[PDB]
Amino acid sequence: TNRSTVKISNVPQTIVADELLRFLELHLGEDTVFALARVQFTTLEVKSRAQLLSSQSKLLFKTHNLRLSEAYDDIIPRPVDPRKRLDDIVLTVGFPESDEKRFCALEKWDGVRCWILTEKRRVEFWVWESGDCYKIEVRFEDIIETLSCCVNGDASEIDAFLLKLKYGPKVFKRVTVHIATKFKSFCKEDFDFMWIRTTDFSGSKSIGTSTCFCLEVHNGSTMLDIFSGLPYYREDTLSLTYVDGKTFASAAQIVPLLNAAILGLEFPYEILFQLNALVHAQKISLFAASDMELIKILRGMSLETALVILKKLHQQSSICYDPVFFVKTQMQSVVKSAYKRLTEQNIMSCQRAYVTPSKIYLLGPELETANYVVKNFAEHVSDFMRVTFVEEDWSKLPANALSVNSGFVKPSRTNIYNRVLSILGEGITVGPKRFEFLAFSASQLRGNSVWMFASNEKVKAEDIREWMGCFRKIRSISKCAARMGQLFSASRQTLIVRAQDVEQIPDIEVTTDGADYCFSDGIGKISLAFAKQVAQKCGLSHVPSAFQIRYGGYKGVIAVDRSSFRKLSLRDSMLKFDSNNRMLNVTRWTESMPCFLNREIICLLSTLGIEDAMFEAMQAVHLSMLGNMLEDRDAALNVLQKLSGENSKNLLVKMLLQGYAPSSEPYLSMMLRVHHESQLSELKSRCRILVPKGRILIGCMDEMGILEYGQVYVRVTLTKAELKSRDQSYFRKIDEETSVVIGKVVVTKNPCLHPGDIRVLDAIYEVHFEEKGYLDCIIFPQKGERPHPNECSGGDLDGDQFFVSWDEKIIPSEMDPPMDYAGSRPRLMDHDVTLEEIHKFFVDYMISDTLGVISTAHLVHADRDPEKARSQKCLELANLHSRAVDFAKTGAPAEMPYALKPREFPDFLERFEKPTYISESVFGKLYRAVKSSLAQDTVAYDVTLEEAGFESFIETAKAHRDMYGEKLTSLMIYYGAANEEEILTGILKTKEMYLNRRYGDMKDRITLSVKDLHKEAMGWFEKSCEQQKKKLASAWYYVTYNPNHRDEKLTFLSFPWIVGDVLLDIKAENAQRQ
Template identity: 40%
Template sequence: MGKFTNRNIAKCAARMGQCFSSTYATVEVSSGQVNMHLPDIKRNGYDFSDGIGKITPDLAMEVAQKLKLDLNPPCAYQIRYAGCKGVVACWPEEGDRIRLSLRSSMTKFFSHHTTLEICSWTRFQPGFLNRQIITLLSTLGVPDEVFWGMQNSMVSKLDKVLVDTDAAFEVVISSCGEQGHTPAIMLSAGFKPQTEPHLRGMLTCVRASQLWGLREKSRIFIHSGRWLMGVLDELGVLEQGQCFIQVSNPSLQNCFLKHGSRFAETKKNFEVIKGLVVIAKNPCLHPGDVRILEAVDAPGLHHLYDCLVFPQKGERPHTNEASGSDLDGDLYFVTWEEALIPPSKKSSQPMQYDPDKPRELHRPVTHKDIIEFFSKNMVNEHLGSICNAHVVHSDLSEHGASDEKCIHLAELAAIAVDFPKTGKIVSMPAQLKPQLYPDFMGKEEFQSYKSNKILGRLYRHIKDAYDEDVSKSSELNFGASDINYDADLEITGSADYIADAWAKKCSYDGQLIGLLKQYKVKREEEVVTGQIWSMPKYVSKKLGDLKEKLGHSYGSLRKEFRQLFENMDSDCEQLNEDEKNKLYERKASAWYQVTYHPEWVQKTLEFQKPDGNEGVVMLSFAWIAADYLARIKVKHQGTENLDFAKPVNSLVRYLADRI
């Protein structure tokens, strides 16, 4: 693992835990190619570059190739390398053969491990509000009608997804991130939810999950917003109070490309944001955690996209002002929606996030110390109860999150967040412990009251629609009689691939069923779309972590079978691109047939009997090759009488000249 010399028990335990992060091993980077001493930028007792380093474009591309992201490569990665952790952003090579530059703030322990491991990367991540952000924006003067109108608009579109392909396409392409690629491709190729069961299942899950998010967390989709990884302006061109934001906008062409298609081409669909923006990082409880910055254009930063570039200038880092965060991988909510900018157009005074000095032993940390610390940590996990108390007191007070009790709770939450680093325990004062809870918190075991503030109004407006929708969604499991077979997708030459397709489907279905059972998720469409809503309530405390792990697991499974789909015999390597595409179409047709044809559906049901999964037909296997099935469908139905101006028809427009 490495050499752990830190004498603070909390930090030593965290350093060991660093070795067990969920990561993707990519490329070896020898120590001679690494600068471990990139200077930190420190001023006024703050580290403006805490957790951020640099990576050269060629190494970044090698990493992207390993992750199969090279057709649309990220510009920054959250990494683990030789005992270091943090983020590295792309910057040009300086001619010294150094490919990776890390700062001392990134070094956590000593290790000889030289594989560059990746935790996450910059990408399109849709923006959603949540209760904490709404509470703070409301406290800062954003009118209730703004949130009310945004939720109504979102629900109106969700209500149309099963009957209106234009509305469905807009929802999946703009608010579902990369998991929305498959339904977006299917909709744009002309498949209809009324006749295509897997598409209907995915759209039903999207609707149920987003309604669940509205009811449980007030997750309101913001079109002019994103979740972005923070990085540093290494050039020093941004002034205090400024930031640089360049976002990718969802387009079906890029979605087609990211799906894995061999016949798509990259189109840089970027937009530089200019003007006032709101940024925040969870947890955010103090009114000063919401920062209002000016987004400016900076040509020297145009190689950075889908990230939030902070200045290195100023009295205090804006990252630290926003919930005491840093640049080691934190995600920030960002919106440039004018209606969400507080009337003052200025940030409130930020809270002072100065953690206590960590307690250190006068001897090396032992395993017994760490075990005792871990036990104490489990007993003293108070962050959740502090955040809940903050919700209650901000709802009860006419001053919202500016109430004295809320400010005190925000200070306690900051200490609780730092517990894994400092080991300092925080407890909830008796006078701040809620005696009753607002109805929108769903605390059925406690006395509750009807909240008259915006969160209560939003909750009650969505509750009935959500309950009705979930009962319908939970019943939507497809039996043999529900599977419509689309003969358009059966093409000449596909019979040669049927036997291989069946073997792979059996393997894929078995592994996917295993994931559904392991994570107690009801339907495959939840996993495929990432729109998970059916996990039992008793696991909700770690719901986010479980969803992330499930997403990683399914992502690996899908990537494995996409690779199997793309594998071809060595004698086929000499084929030109058009010939290869025709071969893949035949293969995709075979994958569709063993999934949908009545004879193969019956075989699937018989195959499942020994495992006790009788009666449910799994359909996602076929759509691992959604891009090639889309080509077949478009060829068959033609392009006559289509309105190419509609976004939902953009795939047909794109493919018309290519097939």
Template identity: 40%
Template sequence: MKVEFVEKLRRNCSSVTFVISCSRAIELRPTKNVHGFFRYRNQMSGRSRGVGQVRFREENVASRAVDLSNEGRFLLYNQQLKFTLLDKKLQHAAPTCCRLENCTIHVGCLTAKDRMLSLWNYQGIVELELDLEEQTLSIHLAFTSMDYRLEFPLSQIRQFAPVEVSGRNQGLLTQIGEIPPYLYRRPFSPSQTDDKYVDVFLNGCLPRKLEKSDGESWRKGWVRTTDFTGSNAIGQSSVYVVELDCSEHRHDILSLLQQTLSFNEVPRSLQVEEVVYSEASQVAIPMWNPENFRVPFGILYKVNSLIQYGKLCVPNLEERFCRLISSGNESTIKLALQALSDEDGCHDPARFLRAKLDEMKKVAPPGVKMKQGMAWIHRVLVTPSKVYCIGPEMEQSNRIVRQHEDYTDRFLRVQFVDEDCSPLTSTALTSDVRSGHTEIYRRIKQVLKEGISIGSRKYEFLAFSASQLRESQLWMFAGKRPPPGSDKPAVTADSIRLQMGDFSQIRNVAKCAARMGQCFSASTPTRKVLPLQVKRIKDITVKTDGVTYCFSDGIGKISQDFARSIAKTCGSTGRIPSAFQIRYGGYKGMVAIDPCASSAFKLYLRPSMRKFDSCHFSLEVLDYTRVLPCFLNRQVISLLSTLGVKDQVFIDLQKQVLKDLDHMLEDDALARKVISCRESNSLALQMLDNGYTSRTEPLLKRLLCVFRDAEVQELRAKAKIFLPKARLLIGCIDETKILKYGEVFVQVSGASYAGGSYYSAQDNVENRDRTTVVTQKVFVAKNPCLHPGDVRVLQAVDVPGLHHMVDCVVFPQVGPKPHPHECSGSDLDGDQYMVSWEERLIPPSVDDPMDYSPPAATVVDHPVTIEEIQEFFLNYMTNDNLGVIANAHVVHADKEKSKARSEKCLELAHLASLAVDFPKTGVPAIIPQELRPREYPDFMEKEHRVSYISSGVLGKLYRAVFTTSFDAQTFSGVRMSDNIVNIFDEDMGVPGYEKHVESALSHKTIYDMKLQQLMSHYGIREEAEIIGGHVLSLSRIFARRQVDVLPKVRKAFEALQAEARSWFYARGFGKVDGEEEAKASAWYHVTYHKDYVGRRNSIQLLSFPWTVAKVLLKVKRSAGRNNDRQNGVGSSEADGYGPPGKRQKL
């Protein structure tokens, strides 16, 4: 938005203030003439729909704003804003409160449209509070010497309507979605406490929003809490009815709320039945376990999931339903139950399930063969008032799950989240001054101590990995006793921990927990390595200023022959990776190929890699060196800007990215080059390589659209700018001792950027083995990076003795300090470094690195107990401030004149170092109040916070995204609901396809059903999002965990593709020449031909035939050659990009 338009509005409309808040939307904060602004957001994605409402105090001011709009005087990111008057006025922004005497609140669920089961009720004085600015509806009541507040987000209210309660009184029915209300409590009279300091704190505690003004006393004193009903009714309920007495104010109250919320004035009849339905002793609420029926665990788990999501009501699960789920094929029943996920609510589940089972008899789904190294894992989310059973989800297995593969379904991931599945803040756990902790904290502690019961199984605390700790997540296990008379030992959480290794010598609680978690790293099992095949070698160290530094911290070596064998096991194709990230017994870190290493030993391990003693001798691989694209981000941009890189450099780089993205659909060659530099083996790239275009193939167009949408979204939200002259590389050490301090060796392969043009590893055979040795200055950084000294400028040199090291950055083993340590205090145990040789980004100066010496760790005088590990988990949740520190750093680096060199930023960088080390040291990072931002730049899109228009480089980049010519609605092109009947590729017709059409149609029905259920489970709207791996839409359960969720989505889709391929190649199919092509043609035919499109499903899913893309592309190539011969066109070699040869220098 141009500043002159803001000033014009201020002059004409008396201090109306505009603040940039999000994509294509603005916020008018309440001022003299403006009450407030409401954004309309997409319910699925949470993103702005580009429409809002502004409330003015005076009609003439509103009219003036409309006039200025009609004159084209309002611009936002070079786009005109249009103001129109509404038919009716918006209500005042101040909360609307209604005090109701002698009313009754019923809490329960609907067992039919006109019947409610009340699990708990309250009689007395109730206050309803409607806050349109915060978009909440709250119920206040006094109960057991406390005031309680139930806060409902308006976005989660499915229905708000008047009802006639049991034929006696009128009432208000509130039916909510999946999210239960946020619960708060406070003493009856918070101002009458004995301790004046406690009183001051209580009157300063604010629920959820910390920026409320002191004048709003109605918010004061509230503290987050858990279910207070005594029967856990809130966690089991989706309907709240406020029954009014016959007071004369009843009509006025209904009229006021009707004006605001626009519900139907005519009440409907509602019969309320009160029952005693208590599960007060169970932590996991709601959890259903039918008596007198033996329901398979997988089915019971699924039914409970449907109950928790509000799709089923427990009283409706009658005997007929229990009989159906207790017998029959378990896979078929679970698939039929999954169909309930798309229903708003089912009051007769037995009838629904019976119909689905009858329907599925016609297309019985084949079983899924699990890929080696994968596992189906159940997951439970624990919120302050209820739990959610999720999955099972396919994911990469770990050492412990593989060792107990017969008990896979007895492992459970448990995660603690807020009611909307966002992370729990520290204030939600520690706001209660008197006791130090809230009821939410005590609830989590109870779950850790008592576990979770599902059916007859009791899951108990096991351990957690480092990544799980950051996500407030852990592992539980349901022990299994051997049958009577068996000599097999019981498998319990305790017995599993004993088998993991010896942790008794680790006397720091945080470090002990981290070492246990090492066993739970997702990995691929490879080969057994006996102790005699392992050689222990020394670490490489130096002592500088009294401090000992380890150059080889976390890295060893591997013989070339053994590396070749495990590369095949890991599924690595082509070049043998130069290094592998591994777990071996109690060892962790990297092993790099050393051509000089004797083949008598398979592994060469260093003391810095040894973390604990273990008898596990299988080598597990977590990652390996490969082509990884590199992107700038906010932190790196901020530091480079601080070090003197001009703003225009970043603007030009982003401009080029946007230009390429804007022309992808028009230029297939450009699309191919753009994608090849980011994704080396995507379906879109294979299509483009084989003659498909976005103008003729709808799935390709969808894939390109989603790719483009995802890239633009990352630019807007993270300033994630693709760098052609850069890579994300795993760090290794120079075993040749040739590199000097200040030097690195960088050799990259695959899609690269040389001489101003892209080339792809798939252009021709020679390019697949092409490598590039960088011989110029590079900057090296590792995320997270907050200190200006975290960016190192080094000289990349060519060392012939290191030419076997590809797609990694090799650091020297000499100097006063290891270069990895200078980069955010990193090491070589698998850390990935951003390495760029883009000349414009090399800063003219660098700062000294920060001192990353960790604080002294607290030790105990006894072996660490499991109770101490549980306590550490809670302490981490309470003190996890890394995200808050990083956000504060972004704000101060944007506002301060000296940017990231400012005192505030330097202090935050130190605190971030403490926070990163907290999982290993147990020493928390405490943020001083003066470092907490009071306002945020526009590019951070902080809702309900004071914002300002950033004049820094990040603000310029953010706003520049919206000046592109891109039009989201036009570009998105073909979507799932669009008609594709006129797009059928005649080249895909193969003689003999007709005999395969019937089976193809049957398999497509099953495939589409499973794909839709996968999409429904994760809340994904577009099929192309799954295929391309660029998921733009996730349900609230998963939206805040994208890094963890996206690999699971990919693995689940890969499993579905593998299952479809097993149908294709069933019973030795394909031995007759041309049979494969004919069957693939039939699969294409039932997907694309107008006679079949939309026959069984209004949503047009296109990926089914592309599960056998190899065969389809073969058909396409064959048709292309035939067309060339018919047209007299000779063959020609594929065009190459870049000079010939296998190695070049930059």
């Protein structure tokens, strides 16, 4: 259980490893030590002797006794069991070749060293091909099936062991250190060198192509090993014969899992995009689809039937070894909106890919939200391809994989980085279509994902870059990335603006304290008429006070000024790039966003001097709200409406506002329980402890010079809770639904890492409120020593959302001096920017450590210091986070030093695979309070007679369930695993990747949204419309099918919910008569 490694107690600084072994000779057996305050022994049997002798205190060195402390991690991972460290055995890789018994031996390796580590979920194979020792770490979770095979004749039936893998292994390499090996405080088996993640070492590239591992164990008496530790072991044995897999060798490092060029004119959009996807998903083996018989059969029939049958094949769980038989069964005995829907529903049928470190995993055409480039190029939607780089497990690609990071002396990019660069340059070659790099978005860059486009005959892969307005005369990499990503972020197209309508005004600057500072970085002003026009254009009945635009090549948030008459009044400080597209791209406007704390904000507030036990009251209110949602109607407009982003448009809001209790309708109860679990998990992970007073407002300013330094104007549309109890010491009446904050206000940005970004400004009143009309927006001052948005980390008014809360409970008494926040030098290079440069920028971001790890390092280092956030390590982490944020402007990757690495994590963070310590120091009580809170009927008549009491008896709901309920079941079988019949962006219990949740939920959300819309489209098509005999009849039929016939083989509970708006409206109308 200790892996033969025991941590030592306090030791003298002049401890000698060599003398320790000689002393250990007089203390234990001969050569019983494996590595050398931690000491690792050769066997676990002598550990008990060592542990017992430690209590006797016999060992001593230089008048300082040494004790065996609690068990820690092994110095070098070797399995305690001698028989678990198999040595000098043979490994083969391939696929079962359509028969479960013919292993396609892609490559044979002899001398493989197998280490079946049991305490840690990992299986290690060491391959010494050529002169490099390349480790193969299978990992327990990867294994989908382990089998005892019979490679030889019937004698010695258990002669080989076969491991069916799904995600593929992690391949490493050994590099010389050329440094001293002792360093006082020491292995004995020459375990030098380090593991750098590397692409497949096989020339034929078998490891990528292969989906199974067969181990040729010398003896069959290894039943003790290869057991329930190795997942999915069935006692049934199978006789395995080897074949020749030389026809599957591929020398192209790109896409090492695709077929060959043995196809005449087969359509790739319906076969190659599906057959290869099936191979990657392991529904059919590579030979099962590369055989000429299946290819010819698939070419035989039309593309629609082929796509349907291949989708049905993908719906299967286990491997379909003989797809020819399946296709014959579903074709001979077949029993037998639009592609250009981007302009109508903005949903893409993207051919997303997952380029792992040593493989390719296409996920077929999955429906997702569209974007501007494909919105225009919808004629060639099948040609686009979203390529995401992952880590052989669909998780975030570690910075250790793409770079050595930390004694290294100089960062040397690993072979995975070169593979990423080559696969970006040469491109993905899926048959006839060869996908080339086009561009990426900012969030797309965060997602480790790239957009690729193939050189089509009508449109070339280079012409799209010409159309998008990038890579023509761009001088810096940062502005090239900004231009590439500006038109990819989700934005809606407003009205077109005249070129002469925009009227530039001088940028407001102060230039004090040495560093140059600009007050209005991205603050423009709209005329009232144009503001109204863009209000209808966006879809708002009122006039928002500020709009975050992307009009032209200039990005920023532009307010509404009733005094000015200029149409747009563009700013010169908005300098991003130059473009001729004079169309406003409004992304977000000013909402009264309900406020919610983050862990970094809590840490900074506690550091500044806010009582730690004072946040616990706000979380107590939060958990009182959360615990009374499955039993009380108070959740109707308190949890779903406020804590979750659901607005009044949600069906649950309708059916709770005027409907029954949370425990009445089983569908309502299940949805509210889903929300309960989601909110509890969020609060436990991300301490979104809602502050009732205060909001996250969009940073703006008033161009009229009244507001002074330390003064802010904040107007908020009061919530219902604040409307019921208004007129406090912090609010001042302005209208029936609005009030201006008068008390102290604390302001910080969303990251809020460095202690001092917390600026407790003064909220004041201006007589010119009717002159300006600023609403739901934080008005920063125009004059002063330093711009207030610059104080909040390195923020600026480019559309930033600034934290505000008026509670004296959490307001600091004092400020800490903020950082300089020096601007990023553009560094306009003469060499222009090429595709290779932006590819290098992408790979450099791959190397750069993400903001999440820096934030969690700051949090972990902030709980064990006399000063919570003012610690020196916290300051270095804050500066490094500033550098990482500025990386989008300066091509300098952010590598976190190993000194700031979190060696052990608190219990608030569920980092189970790491040392864990209780965090009773600083806001650690929040996690355990959340844990304590967490660890504490026929309705057919009501659904039908109270809303559609007329006897419909349409009975079309049975047919709908036969096609829409079956569709929901198929959609759930595609990705879901639980009984969530109406997921609606619900968090599935299974988390294969995690680390991707938004992308993973989007696949479930978009499919559920489309299916409900498809059911609504099916419902509308089946509806004959007055809609009394059609809509009410359909609602009543759905209610009868779901609620009255729940015992039937449907188990939907949500088919009436798709049309639930009509049912709820009818119930509300008929509440008078009942």
